[PDB]
DNA sequence: GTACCTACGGC
DNA sequence: AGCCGTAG
DNA sequence: GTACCTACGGCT
DNA sequence: AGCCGTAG
């Protein structure tokens, strides 16, 4: 090709990879609040077999199928995904079950690969609950090798309930995480309304819900970035003062803020106290255990103040932490900066779609089937006529092709009777095809009475959404206090 | 690399010595901080009986050991300076944390004896169920290994010092033809 | 409760020592392989990673075998399996590998997740019949999968691609062979119980390095072939030629086994620089992967060229000793063999494997042959099998009438019960009737095979031979005398 | 970490800037060393565009391959000290391999411009798509990439230095703004 | 068994 | 005295 | 990801 | 600042 323009090969190279990190690494899909590494570990988990009633699988067998199948990219960034995905501290609602060392709040990895196993949490089949049917597109993979999902079904919204992070080219995303039953009561109300208003809206979502619990101070923030999309807020730890004996105090921290790593502010605390910029501490230490929970213990000097030592470690520590929210997720495959009303308004038509589709997919497989089985109805009723057609046939494409013309019936009920085993010819068989065959009627009935009234189609994501928020439902952690 | 404990009166501190980083996190997440400190090894540690003493002096893991348990070596060595009054080796459920166990005890029996004497080493003993430590949840490792309500933990105890000079020596010496004969006379197939 | 010092370190120490023995370090005498091969071998297997299929991915590979089988670190499972793809340390290679896979100068493969692989069409040979009861499975470490304690290994690859372990108490060095003298060794072992060392020499003329090189003389070979123990000195393929303008160079196109050529040139070097050697006024590999090993030594005009080489020889790895200590684990225990032994452990694993897969093979035919009589009866009595089915209402009812009826076992009825209307036709009907008929020929062939050792001793030749013309090829290093 | 030629005749001497040391050793084996030499990168390496010149000097990439081309940097670079007449870029065919060339084609440009203005800098082609330079055998890395009668070399050009200037502060500079006002403008999303 | 770089955006 | 190759 | 630390035996 | 989390 000879030559190249140092100016035209820079915008070529660069907008490539812009572009492949915002559309296909960085940011989620707003339908199911996914990554595509997220998504390739969930569908792998799925193809693998690796469903919560089944023993744990050994971490590097799963990551290396999703590298080999799907993510053609360093093992390191599929396992500390899945890692992730199985921490009680960094989902509101884990993905993934992990057996072994998962990690901790004070920074520590998980144990390697090898160690380490893991499955689906029972809320993960809600992800991936009607994928195979045709509720979604599928995609070739990478090499063209092998199939993957584009979206996946998403029967609770994800998004939203789980939040977002992540640095892509010329934007980056930080959507906080949400109580399960405030989202499904919202899109509930939106559902009964196109035209409610986000005030409105923030009578279910009362705002985010962190993991980690802690506070968070006033709804200004929380108000600006459910409206726009963007806003700041201000997260704090659970503190309380209490008397330790002789007269003195000290501060007991038992929840801090999400994405803080408790090691690292402890340290942050310790160098204050070194470097003499915060007056009255007499000791430091973390009491935290598997029995007690989290315990951070700030021992106060004897008639100092605590409650002023405690509002100086709020401005100079992440004791207390902003949340800079800034909501950008895919929207037709797009970058979006959005609002709350607009991800509800994309999930609730992403429920609407799959319930449509998985309802256009079993009308087509029992109709299907309501046609073989009037097949094998008038192989029953004329067997004896059957069986010499067949014996008298040399070849399968002359028994076919007789059984066709003989009995009036299709390639694809001449091959069902083909493929009938003898055991099928005991004496009740005949009752219970004729059964199967009423029963069959009546269920498409019902599935075209669904795709007949949008309401009532919209009745059943409804009613859907309602079983998830009843079963996977779960208390608000975060408490939100008027600043 | 020390991730000690928050007491400092040693009779009631108790420090454990892990494979590595896995089994570490494990370990740090389900002690109780408060008496029990963790030690991460590098997995095969330097064999004492086979390297001279200005390697052993330079070996980084060895050093790390003598600044925990602060006693210092040889002639050197100060029960009273003990940090900690149970070490506790907590090696991997496998045949190669059999191997760091042997060679923590030839550092131990050859460089801190009287530490063997005062009943202050211990074995720990976790399920056999698992290999590495790090397969292990937090909660379990907690529970059968260093609850003191609900572990076993193994005292090392030195009963004939001329026994165990000539064990550690034909174990762990650089003549292999003793440790071979050692192998052939006691193999069970 | 308590624990004695002394107790603790010789139970500690004797467990990992026999597992190192046993179980890591040494390899058996029946297939040449140590755990580690033999997990990654069977998981290709098992992957169904045959050389007919695409290439998978190591880390696939590695991840599965390390899951299922193999409970250490994955650099383990992967260097052992770029080991066995690369051309330069096995004589015949076991592993077929997509893409960077190391090199002489030691440059490793590239990392797990860059790399593919597959079997080679000898490995086949080593897992050919696995499927057939011929060799014992065991539980696996876990007890949730099974794994084999040996492969049938229809060549003998211990002598073939030699061994290399350091184990405790004790290691092992076994040098690769050439399989077409191997297999003429075992055929006159198999045709001559008491056959002598020497004899066996006549086929085995001495180790065959994947590298080429030179041997100098037999007695080194000889010795190990007679002790288990003995050194063997091995030589680069130098020679002297000119370069023009009555200067003279040194050209090297093979070196010996396990050197690493750019160490190798690295310490002449050093000499030079250290004017240790002289004479030398140049140093280059001119190695590329169209010309093949070529390591070029200028020499100074009017130095005496072959002086300067005996002292490379003497100084450097140019000229390298294999120290050869035959120990192979013999019945799971180790034990120091001389070649007649390995051969011998090795033919007696093949008439072993033979004779299962024959019983296999025939136990299976005969089951086939007891269903394919139950059909027959089905197809020559068909409407009154159609009737008898008909009239009963359920499945068990059916088999019980079938059973009754027709003198069926419950494996008849029921084969006949799973019997689709297509098998009724013309075409499908003749299908049972020949498939019955050409079993009859194969279940007697099968029984003249088990019922004369010398019949069974003539098919383990006759395969051996087989394996020996699609396989066999020239001997690479030569035996100078 | 360079794994030289024979040859110290710069007119006929060759570098291959390859991503990754699992790449190079292939590289290393395919290769005509007489000729042709090697230099692994270590994944994405540091934007100098972002950079401060101190950050730029400690960079263990940086500073490999100045020492490697022998002209030295900026106000002291000397083209005829260049140890090879032909610095070839050897990335995957893929996004992460297209923005390892961005970032080594902003270092050339802003700390060893006439290196490019004298058309020393080429652009390997490597087979299209797929999986990394390390999945493939060094006999196909040699035939399509690195082979004088078969590779095709795509050698660097600047026509406009305004343009150019302007280009590297859009795309690698710290002003986001910019930089997403250009994808908001050029992104075809299909 | 271990240590350590880089891009990328926002605050 | 430092390398070979399975292990932590 | 890679080149490092460590055990282990027998060659040099 | 330097950290968040997918990438080389
Ligand atoms: C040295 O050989 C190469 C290295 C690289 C870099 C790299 C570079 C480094 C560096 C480290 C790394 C390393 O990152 C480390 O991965 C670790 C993986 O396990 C987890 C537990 O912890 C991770 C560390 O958090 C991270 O620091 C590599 C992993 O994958 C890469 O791409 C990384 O420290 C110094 O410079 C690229 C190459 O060619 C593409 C190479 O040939
Ligand atoms: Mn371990
Ligand atoms: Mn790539
Ligand atoms: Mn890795
Ligand atoms: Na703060
Ligand atoms: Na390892």
Sequence with gaps: INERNITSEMRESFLDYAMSVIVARALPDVRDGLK??????????????????????????????????????????????????????????????????????????????????????????????????????????????????????????????????????????????????????????????????????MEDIEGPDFPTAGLILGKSGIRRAYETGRGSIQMRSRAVIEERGGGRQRIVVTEIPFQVNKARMIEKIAELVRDKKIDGITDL??????????????????????????????????????????????????????????????????????????????????????????????????????????????????????????????????????????????????????????????????????????????????????????????????????? | KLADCSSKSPEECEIFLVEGDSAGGSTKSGRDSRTQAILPLRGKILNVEKARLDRILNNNEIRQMITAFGTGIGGDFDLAKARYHKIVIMTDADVDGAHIRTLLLTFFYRFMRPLIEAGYVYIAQPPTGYKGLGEMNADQLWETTMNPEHRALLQVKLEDAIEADQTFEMLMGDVVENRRQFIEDNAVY
């Excluded at chain 1, 319930?355 to 009308?363: A, C, D, E, K, S």
């Design chain 1, 36 to 201: 595509p590494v997220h998504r390739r570990i969930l569908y792998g988990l799925n193809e693998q077999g690796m469903t919560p009633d089944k023993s744990y699988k050994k971490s590097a067998r799963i990551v290396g199928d999703v590298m080999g199948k799907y993510h053609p990219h360093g093992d390191s960034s599929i396992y500390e995904a899945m890692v992730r995905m199985a921490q009680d501290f960094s989902y509101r609602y884990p993905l993934v079950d992990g057996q072994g060392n998962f990690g901790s709040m004070d920074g520590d990895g998980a144990a390697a690969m090898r160690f380490t196993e893991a499955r689906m949490t029972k809320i993960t089949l809600e992800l991936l609950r009607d994928i195979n049917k045709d509720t979604i597109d599928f995609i070739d993979n990478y090499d063209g090798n092998e199939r993957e999902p584009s979206v996946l079904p998403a029967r609770f919204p994800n998004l939203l309930a789980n939040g977002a992070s992540g640095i892509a080219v010329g934007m980056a995303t930080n959507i906080p995480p949400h109580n399960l039953t405030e989202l499904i009561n919202g899109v509930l109300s939106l559902s009964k309304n196109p035209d409610i208003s986000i005030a409105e809206l």
């Design chain 1, 285 to 483: 230490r973390d009491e935290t255990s598997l029995r007690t929970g989290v315990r951070v213990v700030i021992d106060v000097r004897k008639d100092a103040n605590a409650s002023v030592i405690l509002n100086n470690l709020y401005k100079q520590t992440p004791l207390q932490t902003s949340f800079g929210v800034n909501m950008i997720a895919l929207v037709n495959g797009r970058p979006k900066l959005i609002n709350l009303k607009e991800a509800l308004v994309h999930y609730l038509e992403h429920q609407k779609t799959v319930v449509r589709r998985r309802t256009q997919y079993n009308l087509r497989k029992a109709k299907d089937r309501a046609h073989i089985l009037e097949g094998l109805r008038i192989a029953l009723d004329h067997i004896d006529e059957i069986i010499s057609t067949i014996r008298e046939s040399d070849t399968d494409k002359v028994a076919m092709e007789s059984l066709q013309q003989r009995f009036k019936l299709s390639e694809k009920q001449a091959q069902a009777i083909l493929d009938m085993r003898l055991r099928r010819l005991t004496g009740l068989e005949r009752d219970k095809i004729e059964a199967e065959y009423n029963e069959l009627l009546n269920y498409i009935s019902e599935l075209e009475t669904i795709l007949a009234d949008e309401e009532v189609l919209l009745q059943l994501v409804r009613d859907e959404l309602t079983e998830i928020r009843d079963r996977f439902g779960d208390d608000r952690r975060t408490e939100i206090q008027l600043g």
